[PDB]
Design a protein around this nucleic acid. Structure first.
Ligand SMILES: [Mg+2]
Ligand SMILES: [Mg+2]
Ligand SMILES: [Mg+2]
Ligand SMILES: [Mg+2]
Ligand SMILES: [Mg+2]
Ligand SMILES: [Mg+2]
Ligand SMILES: [Mg+2]
Ligand SMILES: [Mg+2]
Ligand SMILES: [Mg+2]
Ligand SMILES: [Mg+2]
Ligand SMILES: [Mg+2]
Ligand SMILES: [Mg+2]
Ligand SMILES: [Mg+2]
Ligand SMILES: [Mg+2]
Ligand SMILES: [Mg+2]
Ligand SMILES: [Mg+2]
Ligand SMILES: [Mg+2]
Ligand SMILES: [Mg+2]
Ligand SMILES: [Mg+2]
Ligand SMILES: [Mg+2]
Ligand SMILES: [Mg+2]
Ligand SMILES: [Mg+2]
Ligand SMILES: [Mg+2]
Ligand SMILES: [Mg+2]
Ligand SMILES: [Mg+2]
Ligand SMILES: [Mg+2]
Ligand SMILES: [Mg+2]
Ligand SMILES: [Mg+2]
Ligand SMILES: [Mg+2]
Ligand SMILES: [Mg+2]
Ligand SMILES: [Mg+2]
Ligand SMILES: [Mg+2]
Ligand SMILES: [Mg+2]
Ligand SMILES: [Mg+2]
Ligand SMILES: [Mg+2]
Ligand SMILES: [Mg+2]
Ligand SMILES: [Mg+2]
Ligand SMILES: [Mg+2]
Ligand SMILES: [Mg+2]
Ligand SMILES: [Mg+2]
Ligand SMILES: [Mg+2]
Ligand SMILES: [Mg+2]
Ligand SMILES: [Mg+2]
Ligand SMILES: [Mg+2]
Ligand SMILES: [Mg+2]
Lengths: 86, 82, 80, 205
RNA sequence: AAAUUGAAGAGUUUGAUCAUGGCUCAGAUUGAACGCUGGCGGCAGGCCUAACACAUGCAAGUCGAACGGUAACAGGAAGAAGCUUGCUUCUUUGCUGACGAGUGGCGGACGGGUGAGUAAUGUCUGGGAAACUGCCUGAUGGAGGGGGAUAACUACUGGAAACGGUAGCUAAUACCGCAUAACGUCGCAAGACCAAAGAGGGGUACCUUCGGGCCUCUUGCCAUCGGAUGUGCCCAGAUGGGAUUAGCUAGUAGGUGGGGUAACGGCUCACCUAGGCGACGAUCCCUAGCUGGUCUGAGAGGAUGACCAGCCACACUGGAACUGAGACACGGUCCAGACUCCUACGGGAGGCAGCAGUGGGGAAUAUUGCACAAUGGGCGCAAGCCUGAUGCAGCCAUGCCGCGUGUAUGAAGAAGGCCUUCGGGUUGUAAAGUACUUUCAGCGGGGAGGAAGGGAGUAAAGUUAAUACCUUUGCUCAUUGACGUUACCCGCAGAAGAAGCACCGGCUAACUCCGUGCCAGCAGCCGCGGUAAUACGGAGGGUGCAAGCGUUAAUCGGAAUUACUGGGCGUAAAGCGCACGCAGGCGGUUUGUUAAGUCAGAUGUGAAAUCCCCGGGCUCAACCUGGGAACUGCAUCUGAUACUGGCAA
């Protein structure tokens, strides 16, 4: 890039991209674990995974990696499925 | 940020500023929410040099609009003249 | 108190939905002769209670499908 | 931007006195007024209605020293104004500063009055006005400036002024060389051989 | 009170007439181009064609009051020396004023450009709910205690360069935990869970490791709920041409459920149902950015969308995501392509549809200008810095408006030219001469206004422990203008520096002579020209416009010649060969009811500018501007029930 601020913005955007990718992948991993627990049908294991997942999505939403609405939607969906499970 | 500022239309070497309330991002002589008076720097001294609808100005200021230095100067000068 | 349209059901072969035709008089823009114009709207019909030809009262709502944005408030007359 | 050529030629073409000379001398002692200018002036033209309309417009224009563009704008303004279109056109024409100066008699002719206006010799409300087409309004005071009041031509012109008919709607004090435009002149007080309705037709053909 | 007041025809078919009918002209307007000519000023305007390619220089930075620091310059402090004894000199010391590079915060998503695409994912009008919203603003509370790094830097090192690579070092308002938690999120509840950052100014005492702690003020950070602004989304109507395009559509149409989004949603899936659109024109093709508006028109309309403003789309072509409140991003990233360029041939760089400018295309469209003084915009406590936005200047008669190019007198009707039936007539008061003035240009002198502010001191009121600091309010001082030698005013000189273009057969205002001889030539149509041509060319005279005038191109008008207002069809162009008949259009008469159409009233809205009315300011006008009318519409509500419609009889 030709402009001085443009170069620095590109560098900062790459750094932020790597940090955000790490944290977002962590959150998605913890969600997919509870989805696999649901697909295995154990209420207890899925509840353990859900109550460990809950504090992390709220913190990432508060830190701006995702929206509060997205975190709340995830919590609502998982609670719905877990309660609807036998 | 809502701001109260002057939209200079006038003519060459004969400016006639129009006090307008607008989003600060829009261009100067562009989209404005509401006009609240006028100011003519050149004055015959028998004309109305500045007219300000202070009530609507206060309404928007209370809502949270900021004020350009020149609009604040105009408001202060008219209230001082009164 | 609520904006509303009135029309007749022209087709009900869809699951939980119906298409209603709203007809109105409009003065022709140039010539002037009042001409009938029709607007067909895909309407949401829970319970599929509307038969073809029925006259139904409709109101606008949120998008319910790709095309459905109106819901049936009441049936006015049915099975003419 | 102004007609500078011979003046009596226009009067000969229009077939009447246009007051393009001071008047001190009878115009028939200065030219063959009753004959059209040119090699074939003696022949008489069987003139069409369009011809007579054009001749009427040209007569008024050459009386007031106004060119076609300015006269067209005057007609547009008169048509816009409320009331009889021809009458307000005549009022607008008679409201020119040079015409007012000539009526008050500071110039022997409208051209001399126009030169007086142009050369910073006329004041309106104590302000120097140098534009010929300045519209004078009722209750205006037009005065000769002190510095230009000693010009011999104005003191000469006041005699011709007192020898022609005195307009009703102007009050002129010749001693102080100041005058008051009391009111806009009506149709009846100015000459009745101007067929303004011909001009109204010409600007609607 | 006012918001209108408003409409012209002519030539041409025939031996002559009336009609039908086409062609042509007279009017305005232009982002105009060309030809002849050309003084000044004000305002406005200036690649419509190649979104063709681009040399060069500028168009996005800012904060030391977030931080580590000191490369540079200015100090100081130590510090010896030249030696004049401190007049300087070298050397450290980020100790100070500040600041290159760097981390970090905010801003590059605004401002500016263009109209390729787009016939509806767009725009205009009117509605709506299922959403977000940096900075701004109101309220309510918090603001605890830790941790591991990484730039900068140093060392080594690859490459021609671009750009890198390995190893150590340091900091924060960078990053990550842990504590804390409701009116916040999830849930029916029960509960569960979730955050933060300091910095600056001053300081009575008091403690102190002399750093500070501590008090106070200002600003900053976190959470929730609002306000406003902006944005995303949904519906209806409107929004070109073609029917020598009649059928189109399988995520297509709907449903259940899962997933995804800030949000509803075939947005995406899995399955089920087999639908959806269309003659009220779907689909397909061609063409085109839309609107307020502009030109024209009496009006309805026709055309049009330059400049100003609102909206959309694009940023070499195609595609994609990331950061972020906001982009799938003009002067950001990655990939592909065509180009152009650097080379060590391995590799790389670039995107004027930003401002000037170059080449090219074309009939045709300008300066590689000055300034941040005013209005805004970004950062900042502020000073201030940046700003080809903007304010101004330069170029052009491109348009509109104004002004001058002299005024008066002047018959010997001079001379000369032209005509002459030879007497004269005409150019013509025209000139000359004789009087007068000096606008504008030229020279000299004065001089507004665009300037508000900001900085320093003072004083008073807050302030709190504090007459500190800071905020507000005064008062005092010296200052801030690109334009600019400004507008404007005063003085000098001298009529002195300044008039062209088209036409003259009829339409259409203005006529003769000479030359020419159906040749040369003219022409918008009718038409001219073959021996006296008012039509060709020259002269004299005249007519119309005027610093312009003519020619061409394009739109409306005239054109009632797409006729809705406002036309026709026996013979002039025009009644299908005839009948039935579906969709569609219309429908006898009475009563009731309905309020759909219709009418009345009210509300909201119809952005600003433009048009119009009454005024105001530039010496007038153009131009700028105040208030109003208007924007004939759309939607909602309450009324009227004659007419049309629905229903009933
Ligand atoms: Mg002019
Ligand atoms: Mg242009
Ligand atoms: Mg720095
Ligand atoms: Mg823009
Ligand atoms: Mg902490
Ligand atoms: Mg550290
Ligand atoms: Mg916690
Ligand atoms: Mg933090
Ligand atoms: Mg259009
Ligand atoms: Mg669903
Ligand atoms: Mg949808
Ligand atoms: Mg196009
Ligand atoms: Mg018409
Ligand atoms: Mg885009
Ligand atoms: Mg290009
Ligand atoms: Mg691209
Ligand atoms: Mg993001
Ligand atoms: Mg882009
Ligand atoms: Mg950008
Ligand atoms: Mg560029
Ligand atoms: Mg350019
Ligand atoms: Mg060329
Ligand atoms: Mg500035
Ligand atoms: Mg710069
Ligand atoms: Mg600059
Ligand atoms: Mg002679
Ligand atoms: Mg001068
Ligand atoms: Mg000043
Ligand atoms: Mg004639
Ligand atoms: Mg001959
Ligand atoms: Mg000819
Ligand atoms: Mg001859
Ligand atoms: Mg000829
Ligand atoms: Mg033409
Ligand atoms: Mg017509
Ligand atoms: Mg006919
Ligand atoms: Mg026939
Ligand atoms: Mg028949
Ligand atoms: Mg019927
Ligand atoms: Mg009936
Ligand atoms: Mg109704
Ligand atoms: Mg408006
Ligand atoms: Mg005035
Ligand atoms: Mg106004
Ligand atoms: Mg009825």
């Amino acid at each position: 890039a030709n402009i001085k601020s443009a170069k620095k913005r590109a560098i900062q955007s790459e750094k932020a991209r790597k940090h955000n990718a790490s944290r977002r992948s962590m959150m998605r991993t913890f969600i997919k674990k509870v989805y696999a627990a649901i697909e295995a049908g154990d209420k207890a294991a899925a509840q353990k995974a859900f109550n460990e997942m809950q504090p992390i999505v709220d913190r990432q939403a508060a830190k701006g990696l995702i929206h509060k609405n997205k975190a709340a939607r995830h919590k609502a969906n998982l609670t719905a499925q877990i309660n609807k499970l036998a | 940020m809502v701001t109260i500022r002057l939209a200079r239309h006038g003519a060459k070497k004969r400016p006639f500023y129009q006090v307008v309330v607008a989003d600060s991002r829009n261009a100067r002589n562009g989209r404005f929410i509401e006009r609240v008076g006028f100011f003519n720097p050149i004055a015959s001294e028998k004309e109305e040099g500045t007219r300000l609808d202070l009530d609507r100005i206060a309404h928007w200021v209370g809502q949270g609009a900021t004020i350009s230095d020149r609009v604040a100067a105009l408001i202060k000068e008219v209230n001082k003249a009164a | 108190k609520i904006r509303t349209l009135q029309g007749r059901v022209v087709s009900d072969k869809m699951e939980k939905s119906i298409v209603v035709a709203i007809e109105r008089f409009v003065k022709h823009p140039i010539y002037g002769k009042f001409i009938k114009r029709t607007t067909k709207l895909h309407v949401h019909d829970e319970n599929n209670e509307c038969g073809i030809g029925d006259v139904v009262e409709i109101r606008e709502c949120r998008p319910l499908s790709k095309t459905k944005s109106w819901t049936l408030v009441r049936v006015v007359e049915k099975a003419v | 931007a102004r007609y500078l050529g011979p003046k009596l030629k226009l009067s000969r073409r229009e077939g009447t006195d246009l007051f393009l000379k001071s008047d001190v001398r009878a115009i028939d002692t200065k030219c063959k007024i009753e004959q059209a200018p040119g090699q074939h002036g003696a022949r008489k033209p069987r003139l069409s209605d369009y011809g007579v309309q054009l001749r009427e417009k040209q007569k008024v224009r050459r009386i007031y020293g106004v060119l076609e563009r300015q006269f067209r704008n005057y007609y547009k303004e008169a048509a816009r104004l409320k009331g009889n279109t021809g009458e307000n056109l005549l009022a607008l024409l008679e409201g020119r500063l040079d015409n007012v100066v000539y009526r008050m008699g500071f110039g022997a002719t409208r051209a001399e009055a126009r030169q007086l206006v142009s050369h910073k010799a006329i004041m309106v409300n104590g302000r120097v006005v140098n534009i010929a087409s300045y519209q004078v309004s009722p209750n205006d005071v037009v005065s000769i400036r002190e510095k230009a009041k000693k010009q011999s031509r104005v003191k000469a012109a006041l005699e011709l002024a007192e020898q022609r008919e005195k307009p009703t709607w102007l009050e002129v004090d010749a001693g102080k060389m100041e005058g008051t435009f009391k009111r806009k002149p009506e149709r009846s007080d100015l000459s009745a051989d101007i067929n303004e309705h011909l001009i109204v037709e010409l600007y609607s053909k």
